[PDB]
Amino acid sequence: IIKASTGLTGLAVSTNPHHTLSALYGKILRAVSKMPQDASYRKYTEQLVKQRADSVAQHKDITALEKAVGCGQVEELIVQAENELILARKMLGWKPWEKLVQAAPAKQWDWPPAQIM
Amino acid sequence: TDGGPLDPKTALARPEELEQRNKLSGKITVPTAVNLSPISGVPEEHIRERRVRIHIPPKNAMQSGTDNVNTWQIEFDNRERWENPLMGWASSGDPLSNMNVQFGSPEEAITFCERNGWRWYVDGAAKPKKERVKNYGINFAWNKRTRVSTK
Amino acid sequence: AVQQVRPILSVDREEARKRALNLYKAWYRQIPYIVMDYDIPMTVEQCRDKLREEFVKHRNVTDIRVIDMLVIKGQMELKESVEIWKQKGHIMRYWKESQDPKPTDFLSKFIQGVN
Amino acid sequence: ISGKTMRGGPRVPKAAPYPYKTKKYSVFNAIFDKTSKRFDENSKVICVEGPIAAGKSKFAKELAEELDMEYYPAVDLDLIYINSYGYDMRKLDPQLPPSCRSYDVRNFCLDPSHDLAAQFQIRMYMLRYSQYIDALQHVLSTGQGVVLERSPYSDFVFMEAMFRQGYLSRGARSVYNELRQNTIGELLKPHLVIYLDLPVDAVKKQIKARNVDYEVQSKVFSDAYLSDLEQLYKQQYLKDISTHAELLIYDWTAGGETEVVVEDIERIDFNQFEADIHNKKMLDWRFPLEAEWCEARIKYCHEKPDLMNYFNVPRFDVPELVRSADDGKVWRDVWFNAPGMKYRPGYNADMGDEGLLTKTKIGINQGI
Numbered sequence: 001i002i003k004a005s006t007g008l009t010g011l012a013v014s015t016n017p018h019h020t021l022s023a024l025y026g027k028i029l030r031a032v033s034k035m036p037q038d039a040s041y042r043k044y045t046e047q048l049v050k051q052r053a054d055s056v057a058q059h060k061d062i063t064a065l066e067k068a069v070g071c072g073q074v075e076e077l078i079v080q081a082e083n084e085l086i087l088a089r090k091m092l093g094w095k096p097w098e099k100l101v102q103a104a105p106a107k108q109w110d111w112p113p114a115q116i117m
Numbered sequence: 118t119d120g121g122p123l124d125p126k127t128a129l130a131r132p133e134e135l136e137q138r139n140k141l142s143g144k145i146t147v148p149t150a151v152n153l154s155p156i157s158g159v160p161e162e163h164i165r166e167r168r169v170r171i172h173i174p175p176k177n178a179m180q181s182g183t184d185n186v187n188t189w190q191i192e193f194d195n196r197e198r199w200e201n202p203l204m205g206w207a208s209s210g211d212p213l214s215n216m217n218v219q220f221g222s223p224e225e226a227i228t229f230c231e232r233n234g235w236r237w238y239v240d241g242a243a244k245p246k247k248e249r250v251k252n253y254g255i256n257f258a259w260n261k262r263t264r265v266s267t268k
Numbered sequence: 269a270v271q272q273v274r275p276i277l278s279v280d281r282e283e284a285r286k287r288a289l290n291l292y293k294a295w296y297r298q299i300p301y302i303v304m305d306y307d308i309p310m311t312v313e314q315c316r317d318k319l320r321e322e323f324v325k326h327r328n329v330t331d332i333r334v335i336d337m338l339v340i341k342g343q344m345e346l347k348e349s350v351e352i353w354k355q356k357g358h359i360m361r362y363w364k365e366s367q368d369p370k371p372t373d374f375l376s377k378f379i380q381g382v383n
Numbered sequence: 384i385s386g387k388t389m390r391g392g393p394r395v396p397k398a399a400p401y402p403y404k405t406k407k408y409s410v411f412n413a414i415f416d417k418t419s420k421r422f423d424e425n426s427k428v429i430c431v432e433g434p435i436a437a438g439k440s441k442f443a444k445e446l447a448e449e450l451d452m453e454y455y456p457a458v459d460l461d462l463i464y465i466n467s468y469g470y471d472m473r474k475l476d477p478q479l480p481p482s483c484r485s486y487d488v489r490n491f492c493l494d495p496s497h498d499l500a501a502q503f504q505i506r507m508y509m510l511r512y513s514q515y516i517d518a519l520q521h522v523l524s525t526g527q528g529v530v531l532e533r534s535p536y537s538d539f540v541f542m543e544a545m546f547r548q549g550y551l552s553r554g555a556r557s558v559y560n561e562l563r564q565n566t567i568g569e570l571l572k573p574h575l576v577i578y579l580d581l582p583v584d585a586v587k588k589q590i591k592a593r594n595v596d597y598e599v600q601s602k603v604f605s606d607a608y609l610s611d612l613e614q615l616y617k618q619q620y621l622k623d624i625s626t627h628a629e630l631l632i633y634d635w636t637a638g639g640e641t642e643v644v645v646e647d648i649e650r651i652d653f654n655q656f657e658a659d660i661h662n663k664k665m666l667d668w669r670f671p672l673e674a675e676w677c678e679a680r681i682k683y684c685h686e687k688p689d690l691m692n693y694f695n696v697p698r699f700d701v702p703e704l705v706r707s708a709d710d711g712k713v714w715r716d717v718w719f720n721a722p723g724m725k726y727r728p729g730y731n732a733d734m735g736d737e738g739l740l741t742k743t744k745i746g747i748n749q750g751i
């Protein structure tokens with residue numbers, strides 16, 4: 001029981017998608033555990049990856065996992081988890097949870113711009 | 118931090134490269150008066166010869182609307198136009214004669230002209246509003262010269 | 269006054285001066301390969317004199333961001349001259365070989381035309 | 384390189400492993416047995432790396448256990464001071480001349496400014512060479528990859544660290560550079576390298592995590608020396624290897640866990656370097672024909688005395704690496720008359736070997 005092709009070039013089929021997804025989800029938890037608790041991105045990522053990890057651990061079949069997650073095929077789930085792992089590695093250094101780095105200049109976001117007011 | 122794989126172009130870089138990236142990520146102190154004439158690509162003759170007028174545009178006297186008055190604008194000095202000898206059109210060698218640039222306040226246009234290095238001048242300031250009283254009872258008055266003879 | 273902005277490739281004036289001198293060195297090396305390849309009627313010494321005049325008319329600027337923008341644009345023209353990326357009609361544009369010169373005295377400007 | 388968990392169990396070989404320690408592989412043996420019938424995704428050379436104290440042995444053993452690879456620890460000088468019979472030759476130093484005495488790692492730590500320490504560094508490179516072919520005999524002949532605690536490529540940084548600290552002269556540096564230019568070009572660069580990045584102070588803290596006496600009462604483990612190794616590694620060696628091997632740098636200030644290090648390996652696509660035949664990544668390990676695979680296996684199995692005899696270069700201008708002729712004869716008549724090395728290690732009657740009257744077998748790639 002294996003998929004013949006994904007119908008989508010550049011991504012071959014995965015031999016063990018469940019362990020790859022679980023390892024990427026554990027690495028996302030390890031990257032997000034260094035974030036401060038007051039940051040909303042940590043809570044949102046923890047809720048997402050906990051729901052996805054429960055979906056992976058609850059379902060042993062591949063197409064049942066793809067239906068239960070509902071996002072897409074499981075190789076694209078691996079791609080999404082890798083992208084969110086790269087994001088969770090980067091946002092520790094980008095430091096998003098603080099205040100505004102630059103205040104709003106005067107008449108910067110006014111449309112139409114030529115008025116006296 | 119994270120216990121994953123480190124970035125190889127930051128760990129293996131020399132200390133001079135780490136100092137070079139951190140200095141460009143900072144903020145330098147510059148004067149706010151910046152001349153950008155060699156950057157804008159304008160020829161130098163138009164820089165030293167043209168005069169720029171900052172003005173509020175004139176209201177059309179045949180029309181009561183003032184929506185087109187509500188902005189300031191930059192316009193350039195009118196050079197020579199001529200008639201081409203073939204067919205009779207209005208040829209012009211002035212590339213900047215057709216450009217009106219809209220602005221909100223004369224201070225913004227003055228700072229823009231100081232940025233681009235133009236020789237600027239303001240034709241007139243903002244028009245003050247005079248309080249004029251208008252009501253219908255003045256038209257029909259007793260021992261007054263303002264009694265209207267129409268209607 | 270005072271303003272805190274992001275820099276372009278240099279923090280102070282000394283690095284921008286070093287980049288301008290690097291432009292002068294690279295343009296000096298690129299001129300004899302420009303002359304022998306582009307089929308232009310300009311001697312190598314005339315090309316170096318024109319390069320000197322192009323630097324002289326930009327000696328007057330003082331702001332480091334303006335200087336570094338000029339360095340970036342000069343590096344773009346250098347990269348468009350190392351690879352050929354151009355024709356002989358655009359190389360001679362620095363000399364302005366087709367424009368007849370105009371007089372500067374007020375009497376000749378009065379006689380010729382209102383400009 | 385798939386681990387133990389994604390494979391579903393222990394690794395199965397693609398073919399029968401060749402007895403490379405017992406049967407000699409030569410040109411006439413290359414017809415019946417072919418090299419590339421055993422190779423798979425797990426048949427890659429992984430070299431773990433790092434500073435003086437970084438927990439390389441336990442992490443490399445766990446990486447060998449999880450990836451189903453052969454573990455090769457870092458070579459020390461107990462491989463030649465203790466022979467095959469267990470007799471340590473460090474007890475022969477009263478009879479030996481002082482220029483021919485035993486000099487090991489603790490002798491470097493107690494006496495850094497000694498002359499033979501330079502010899503010791505050269506000796507260590509030979510020992511690393513003596514395992515690297517033993518690495519490349521294992522990958523090519525059996526088809527199972529190896530993990531190396533340190534590499535022969537990773538040993539010139541130690542030479543330059545002794546040189547900048549003043550423990551070596553210009554002559555010993557020139558000699559070791561000449562042996563490196565003579566010898567390193569015959570080796571194949573490893574597939575993957577793992578560098579355990581650590582600060583200069585924390586390694587010193589890890590020295591206090593080891594509590595061995597000769598590394599805490601010594602002088603070499605200072606602030607400038609470990610910074611010299613860190614600078615040498617991260618500015619020359621890893622940048623030279625990353626044009627061939629997929630470099631993985633981890634921070635190991637904490638204890639760490641080997642499972643995430645395993646799980647970063649399967650995210651690497653090793654087939655993206657096979658699109659270009661002139662790619663610098665995996666250049667030494669690609670072979671277009673089966674005969675080139677057998678050519679490399681013949682070079683690394685039947686020509687290990689060739690690569691060990693490439694070290695025979697003459698350098699006599701240095702006075703640290705030249706043994707005196709009277710001291711050489713005294714060293715020969717003490718060292719080769721010692722128990723355990725009077726003869727070849729198979730045929731020694733003084734250590735209880737029996738049946739010597741009918742025995743005519745010798746070891747393949749064996750030091751005489």
Ligand SMILES: Nc1nc2c(ncn2[C@H]2C[C@H](O)[C@@H](COP(=O)(O)OP(=O)(O)OP(=O)(O)O)O2)c(=O)[nH]1
Nearest residue numbers: 434435436437438439440441457491504507538541
């Ligand atoms: N002089 C000299 N000493 C060396 C060389 N290579 C290793 N050592 C010495 C320095 C230290 O005393 C000791 C540390 O060995 P390693 O750095 O290979 O790691 P170690 O044996 O501590 O294993 P570990 O990383 O803790 O698992 O070995 C070398 O090329 N020259």
